[PDB]
Design an enzyme around this catalytic site. Structure first.
Site, PDB file in Angstrom:
ATOM      1  N   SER A 111      33.664  23.367  32.795  1.00 21.94           N
ATOM      2  CA  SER A 111      32.451  23.103  33.463  1.00 21.94           C
ATOM      3  C   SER A 111      31.938  21.713  33.052  1.00 21.94           C
ATOM      4  CB  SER A 111      31.511  24.275  33.151  1.00 21.94           C
ATOM      5  OG  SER A 111      30.244  24.184  33.643  1.00 21.94           O
ATOM      6  N   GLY A 284      34.597  40.664  43.727  1.00 18.86           N
ATOM      7  CA  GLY A 284      35.055  40.398  42.384  1.00 18.86           C
ATOM      8  C   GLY A 284      34.359  39.247  41.676  1.00 18.86           C
ATOM      9  N   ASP A 315      32.931  28.031  43.378  1.00 24.38           N
ATOM     10  CA  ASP A 315      33.367  29.027  42.410  1.00 24.38           C
ATOM     11  C   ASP A 315      32.229  29.945  41.883  1.00 24.38           C
ATOM     12  OD1 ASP A 315      32.034  27.621  40.551  1.00 24.38           O
ATOM     13  OD2 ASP A 315      33.698  27.230  39.257  1.00 24.38           O
ATOM     14  N   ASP A 355      36.749  32.579  39.569  1.00 25.49           N
ATOM     15  CA  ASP A 355      35.400  32.072  39.479  1.00 25.49           C
ATOM     16  C   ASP A 355      35.075  31.346  38.163  1.00 25.49           C
ATOM     17  OD1 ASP A 355      34.233  34.022  37.795  1.00 25.49           O
ATOM     18  OD2 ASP A 355      33.043  34.858  39.318  1.00 25.49           O
ATOM     19  N   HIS A 356      33.937  30.683  38.193  1.00 27.66           N
ATOM     20  CA  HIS A 356      33.504  29.814  37.106  1.00 27.66           C
ATOM     21  C   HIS A 356      33.562  30.461  35.730  1.00 27.66           C
ATOM     22  CE1 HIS A 356      31.612  25.996  36.328  1.00 27.66           C
ATOM     23  NE2 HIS A 356      30.934  26.593  35.383  1.00 27.66           N
ATOM     24  N   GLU A 358      35.153  33.690  35.285  1.00 26.15           N
ATOM     25  CA  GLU A 358      36.399  34.407  35.122  1.00 26.15           C
ATOM     26  C   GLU A 358      37.457  33.560  34.433  1.00 26.15           C
ATOM     27  OE1 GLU A 358      37.509  35.388  39.199  1.00 26.15           O
ATOM     28  OE2 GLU A 358      36.619  37.313  39.033  1.00 26.15           O
ATOM     29  N   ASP A 363      33.877  36.657  32.592  1.00 25.16           N
ATOM     30  CA  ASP A 363      33.782  37.740  33.614  1.00 25.16           C
ATOM     31  C   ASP A 363      35.247  38.258  33.823  1.00 25.16           C
ATOM     32  OD1 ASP A 363      31.780  38.984  35.684  1.00 25.16           O
ATOM     33  OD2 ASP A 363      33.364  38.474  36.924  1.00 25.16           O
ATOM     34  N   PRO A 364      35.433  39.565  33.902  1.00 25.47           N
ATOM     35  CA  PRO A 364      36.773  40.105  34.079  1.00 25.47           C
ATOM     36  C   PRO A 364      37.367  39.753  35.425  1.00 25.47           C
ATOM     37  CG  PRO A 364      35.151  41.813  34.404  1.00 25.47           C
ATOM     38  CD  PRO A 364      34.403  40.596  34.052  1.00 25.47           C
TER      39      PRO A 364
HETATM   40 CA   LIG Z   1      35.401  38.966  38.482  1.00 25.73          CA
END
Ligand SMILES: [Ca+2]
Ligand SMILES: [Zn+2]
Length: 392
Positions: A111, A284, A315, A355-356, A358, A363-364
């Site tokens: 990031s 998700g 993301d 994602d940012h 994940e 985040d799982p």
């Molecule tokens: Ca996720």
């Protein structure tokens, strides 16, 4: 084939904390585990930096430099005077004394950490003209970070970095939402925001600003104060540098060094409509970003700022378009990855469907093989050669 032995250094973004903080829950691994440990375990020496999440890239770069070689953080006299914060900050033992002895490092940044990494490199090599001038003029001392001439960085890898900023900052309620994102990340770590923990838990490292959570103060309460503080209201902030105008400004002076390899990874967790052209969050995506941020990112257009349809894919936090490398107010070259990692240019490694959060394990995502991703990366870095020879 391992062409080098330099250690890897991990660097977080606008959220992030040391390995002892957050009850051991790692920014670099989240619910997935301990990325650092994974790497070390596989033969890739790896360390972790923790600097001010909300502080300005400059602030962070100074903190990083001190954290790395040891010493008392020095924000620069010109800088300090310009923005109204302390010149000297905390003291660090130094993670890698090998640096003063001619060793180099690979930096892996997530990031906003990507902006920081770039800046660190620029300062290290070139220093700061403003810094230097002010010192000569007022007879004050200069940190070596302002002088230039260092040879410390082999490569910089950025992951989900807003090189050109993130339209997230344009949300009408960005101030409140941004702090909710911090609460979200605490939540991930199994930490409450309405509890006045006596332990530190998450140190924002605002020593320069004279800010710290007080006895009896919850994170909710603390955040309420931060929102009204100089770490949110000044231009010497992550808030500013994260913006589209802020990132441009930073890009105008923070250039890619020819002596350094740069690799860029993009992230996306969205789908396109048909009827609107907008991007929407994929099933998700982290709950917070899916409800609060993604809709906006995927629909926000601004002709003046230059925000068109290209910026919509995101993301959950950063527009994908901003991630391959600096472009707005930038002279840096970006080249799509072709199997060959090139020096002094952004090797655009593509876009990954994560994602940012994940991507760092916060985040799982059972479908994202995180370990393999970092390991593949480490091997790439370790393969980087000192120099090349032209050949047919
Ligand atoms: Ca996720
Ligand atoms: Zn500052």
């Amino acid at each position: 084939s391992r062409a080098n032995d330099a250690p890897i250094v991990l660097l977080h973004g606008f959220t992030g904390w040391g390995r002892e903080e957050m009850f051991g829950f790692k920014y670099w691994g989240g619910v997935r585990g301990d990325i650092e440990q994974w790497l070390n375990d596989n033969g890739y020496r790896t360390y972790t930096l923790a600097v001010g999440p909300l502080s300005s890239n400059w602030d962070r770069a100074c903190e990083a430099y001190a954290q790395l070689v040891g010493g008392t953080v020095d924000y620069g006299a010109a800088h300090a005077a310009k923005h109204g914060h302390a010149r000297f900050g905390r003291t660090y033992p130094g993670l890698l004394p090998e640096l003063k002895r001619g060793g180099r490092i690979h930096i892996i940044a997530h990031s906003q950490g990507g902006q920081t990494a770039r800046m660190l490199v620029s300062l290290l090599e070139n220093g700061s003209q403003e810094c230097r001038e002010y010192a000569k003029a007022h007879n004050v001392s200069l940190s070596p970070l302002c002088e230039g001439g260092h040879h410390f960085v082999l490569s910089v890898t950025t992951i989900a970095t807003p090189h050109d900023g993130t339209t997230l900052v344009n949300m009408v309620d960005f101030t409140d939402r941004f702090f909710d994102l911090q609460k979200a990340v605490l939540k991930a770590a199994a930490v409450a925001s309405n509890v006045p923990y006596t332990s530190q838990v998450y140190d924002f490292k605002l020593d320069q600003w004279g800010l710290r959570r007080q006895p009896g103060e919850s994170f909710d309460q603390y955040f309420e104060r931060l929102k009204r503080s100089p770490v949110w209201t000044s231009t010497d902030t992550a808030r500013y540098d994260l913006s589209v105008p802020g990132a441009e400004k930073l890009n105008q002076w923070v250039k890619a060094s020819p002596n350094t390899y740069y690799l860029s990874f993009a992230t996306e967790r969205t789908y396109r409509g048909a009827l609107t052209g907008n991007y929407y969050p994929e099933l998700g995506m982290n709950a917070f970003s899916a409800v609060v941020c993604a809709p906006f990112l995927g629909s926000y257009r601004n002709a003046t700022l230059g925000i068109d349809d290209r910026w919509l894919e995101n993301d959950g936090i950063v527009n994908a378009f901003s991630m391959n490398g600096p472009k707005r107010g930038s002279t840096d070259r970006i080249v799509p990855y072709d199997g060959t990692i090139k020096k002094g240019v952004w090797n655009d490694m593509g876009t990954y469907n994560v994602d940012h959060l994940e991507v760092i394990g916060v985040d799982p995502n059972p479908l994202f093989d995180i370990r393999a991703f970092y390991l593949r990366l480490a091997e790439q870095l370790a393969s980087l050669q000192p120099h090349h020879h032209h050949h047919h």
